[PDB]
Symmetry: C2
Subunit: 53 residues, 2 copies
């Protein structure tokens, strides 16, 4: 079980468990942020665009 | 402060806080499941397609 059509549980309010490999891909964790967008019948969440100069 | 390019915090291990309006769109919550797919540099979470007939 990795990604691409893999079933995960929610939590309560909405906190869905993102795969370690996925957050690893984004280089994010805990205190980091994601950019959540919506696509009709599904959710689209990218890592937040880091404003680092 | 709704969906569509909105920034959210993670948690630790990856549990990202899905908008109440989003989980509401999917009619999911807590005990429910999502189908997580990966899109290059982003994550795609659909609701788990319910096998109810």
């Amino acid at each position: 079980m990795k990604s691409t059509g893999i079933v995960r549980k929610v939590d309560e309010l909405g906190r869905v468990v993102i795969p370690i490999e996925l957050r690893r891909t984004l280089g994010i964790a805990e205190k980091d942020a994601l950019e959540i967008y919506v696509d009709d019948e599904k959710i689209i969440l990218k890592k937040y665009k880091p404003n680092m100069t």
